[PDB]
Write an enzyme that holds these catalytic residues in place. Structure first.
Site, PDB file in Angstrom:
ATOM      1  N   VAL A  28       0.826  -1.198   0.000  1.00  0.00           N
ATOM      2  CA  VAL A  28       0.000   0.000   0.000  1.00  0.00           C
ATOM      3  C   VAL A  28       0.879   1.274   0.000  1.00  0.00           C
ATOM      4  CG1 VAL A  28      -0.339   0.385   2.487  1.00  0.00           C
ATOM      5  CG2 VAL A  28      -2.254   0.793   0.928  1.00  0.00           C
ATOM      6  N   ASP A 166       3.162   9.835  11.714  1.00  0.00           N
ATOM      7  CA  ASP A 166       4.517  10.348  11.510  1.00  0.00           C
ATOM      8  C   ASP A 166       5.078  11.443  12.434  1.00  0.00           C
ATOM      9  OD1 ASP A 166       4.846   8.670   9.176  1.00  0.00           O
ATOM     10  OD2 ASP A 166       6.380  10.188   8.660  1.00  0.00           O
TER      11      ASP A 166
HETATM   12  C1  LIG Z   1      -4.326   4.575   3.420  1.00  0.00           C
HETATM   13  C2  LIG Z   1      -3.994   4.414   4.911  1.00  0.00           C
HETATM   14  N1  LIG Z   1      -4.800   4.373   6.000  1.00  0.00           N
HETATM   15  N2  LIG Z   1      -4.093   4.249   7.047  1.00  0.00           N
HETATM   16  C3  LIG Z   1      -2.778   4.197   6.684  1.00  0.00           C
HETATM   17  C4  LIG Z   1      -1.623   4.052   7.591  1.00  0.00           C
HETATM   18  C5  LIG Z   1      -1.748   3.928   8.978  1.00  0.00           C
HETATM   19  C6  LIG Z   1      -0.586   3.793   9.731  1.00  0.00           C
HETATM   20  C7  LIG Z   1       0.690   3.800   9.191  1.00  0.00           C
HETATM   21  C8  LIG Z   1       1.892   3.680  10.079  1.00  0.00           C
HETATM   22  C9  LIG Z   1       2.410   4.852  10.660  1.00  0.00           C
HETATM   23  C10 LIG Z   1       3.545   4.849  11.506  1.00  0.00           C
HETATM   24  C11 LIG Z   1       3.982   6.172  12.051  1.00  0.00           C
HETATM   25  O1  LIG Z   1       3.207   7.140  11.954  1.00  0.00           O
HETATM   26  N3  LIG Z   1       5.197   6.270  12.711  1.00  0.00           N
HETATM   27  C12 LIG Z   1       5.718   7.499  13.275  1.00  0.00           C
HETATM   28  C13 LIG Z   1       5.994   7.158  14.702  1.00  0.00           C
HETATM   29  C14 LIG Z   1       4.754   7.920  14.365  1.00  0.00           C
HETATM   30  C15 LIG Z   1       4.145   3.592  11.785  1.00  0.00           C
HETATM   31  C16 LIG Z   1       3.634   2.418  11.226  1.00  0.00           C
HETATM   32  C17 LIG Z   1       2.507   2.454  10.364  1.00  0.00           C
HETATM   33  C18 LIG Z   1       1.930   1.172   9.767  1.00  0.00           C
HETATM   34  C19 LIG Z   1       0.829   3.950   7.815  1.00  0.00           C
HETATM   35  C20 LIG Z   1       2.194   3.986   7.172  1.00  0.00           C
HETATM   36  C21 LIG Z   1      -0.335   4.046   7.028  1.00  0.00           C
HETATM   37  O2  LIG Z   1      -2.747   4.296   5.332  1.00  0.00           O
END
Ligand SMILES: Cc1nnc(-c2ccc(-c3cc(C(=O)NC4CC4)ccc3C)c(C)c2)o1
EC number: 2.7.11.24
Length: 349
Positions: A28, A166
């Site tokens: 994704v 993030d």
């Molecule tokens: C489309 C869609 N809907 N939801 C997503 C989504 C949700 C969570 C993540 C995600 C974010 C962090 C992060 O913010 N890390 C930093 C430490 C904060 C870490 C791991 C993941 C899977 C991602 C990449 C995408 O994509």
């Protein structure tokens, strides 16, 4: 408890080894998010996002950033802030530990996708910004700064519910160069390195995002840092004596004083037809002097959010020890710390 059984597959030239509970992995983000797959968590019935960290202990900087992301994810427990559903490694010992997988909710889209592809009523704007501010109050309460808040790291489901992604990870100069969304939401003090910045940079970003939701147009789409600064100063005015004294960068101070003084413009004329309360809040977010910007907690109590604001339901975070940020450690030391954090993980209720 016991170690789940893991199975392997290749997903875009990379081998994913994950517990059986996770089914139907598909990549994704179009590369954008890193190495991320959507999956079905048969144990919870949740659609999840799974990030596989790429060779996370390759340098001190990678090892420390791996630990940092995990620490951040483990701490955040708030509806409007991405949190950790699961973290795993197929490794059976610290000696073999060399990959980290982080599991979170999959919202389904980002705000970029929404504000591009849908019509947002004033009520949609109220609800979306309320949620970003409610999430930021929480984040800032733990002494964490997002620093890079923009539509693309706001994840949103089909009911317009929002989680911030993030935060606390802080881009190459190249990535910030030119006509790029990567710089359009950045507070000027951080864009031009005016001074030691703080959590107030995030409020500037919220102002930029809110303006864009209201008009459907980027607020400061500069072609480069200087053009962006000119766009900014045209709207909010050039700095005054008081702010100039606070720009510790003698270099940046000197340059900004070379510009013709401009007054702040009338926001009611800039945001024609918008809710007067939205205009008032934007004026309070888009203040050049970061000392004088409205805070997330102050913003939640603003009249624009009367319909959503509930002071008994805007929690703060438990203390976040980030003393590790000042620490110099070897790769194996960052790795062992990360391992302890993986091993001690307890999934949410
Ligand atoms: C489309 C869609 N809907 N939801 C997503 C989504 C949700 C969570 C993540 C995600 C974010 C962090 C992060 O913010 N890390 C930093 C430490 C904060 C870490 C791991 C993941 C899977 C991602 C990449 C995408 O994509």
């Amino acid at each position: 408890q016991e170690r789940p059984t893991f199975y392997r597959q290749e997903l875009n030239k990379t081998i994913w080894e994950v517990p059986e509970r996770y089914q139907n992995l598909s990549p994704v983000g179009s590369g954008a998010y890193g190495s991320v797959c959507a999956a079905f968590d048969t144990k919870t019935g949740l659609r999840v996002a799974v990030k596989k960290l790429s060779r996370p202990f390759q340098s001190i900087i990678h090892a420390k950033r791996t630990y940092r992301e995990l620490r951040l994810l483990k701490h955040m427990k708030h509806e409007n802030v991405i949190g950790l559903l699961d973290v795993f490694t197929p490794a059976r010992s610290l000696e073999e530990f060399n990959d980290v997988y982080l599991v979170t909710h999959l919202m389904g889209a980002d705000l970029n996708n929404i504000v591009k592809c849908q019509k947002l009523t004033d009520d949609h704007v109220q609800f979306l910004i309320y949620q970003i501010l409610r999430g930021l109050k929480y984040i800032h309460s733990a002494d964490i700064i997002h620093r890079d808040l923009k539509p693309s790291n706001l994840a949103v489901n089909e009911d317009c519910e929002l989680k911030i992604l993030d935060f606390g990870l802080a881009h190459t100069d190249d990535e910030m160069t030119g006509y790029v969304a990567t710089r359009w939401y950045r507070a000027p003090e951080i864009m031009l390195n005016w001074m030691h910045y703080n959590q107030t940079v995030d409020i500037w970003s919220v102002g930029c995002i809110m303006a864009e939701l209201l008009t459907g147009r980027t607020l400061f789409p500069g072609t480069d840092h200087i053009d962006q600064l000119k766009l900014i100063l045209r709207l909010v005015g050039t700095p005054g004596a008081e702010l100039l004294k606070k720009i510790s960068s003698e270099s940046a101070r000197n340059y900004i004083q070379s510009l013709t003084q401009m007054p702040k413009m009338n926001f009611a004329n800039v945001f024609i037809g918008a809710n007067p309360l939205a205009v008032d809040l934007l004026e309070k977010m888009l203040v050049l002097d970061s000392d004088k910007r409205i805070t997330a907690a102050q913003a939640l109590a603003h009249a624009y959010f009367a319909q959503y604001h509930d002071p008994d339901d805007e929690p703060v975070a438990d203390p976040y020890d980030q003393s590790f940020e000042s620490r110099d450690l070897l790769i194996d030391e960052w790795k062992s710390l990360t391992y302890d954090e993986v091993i001690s993980f307890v999934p949410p209720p």
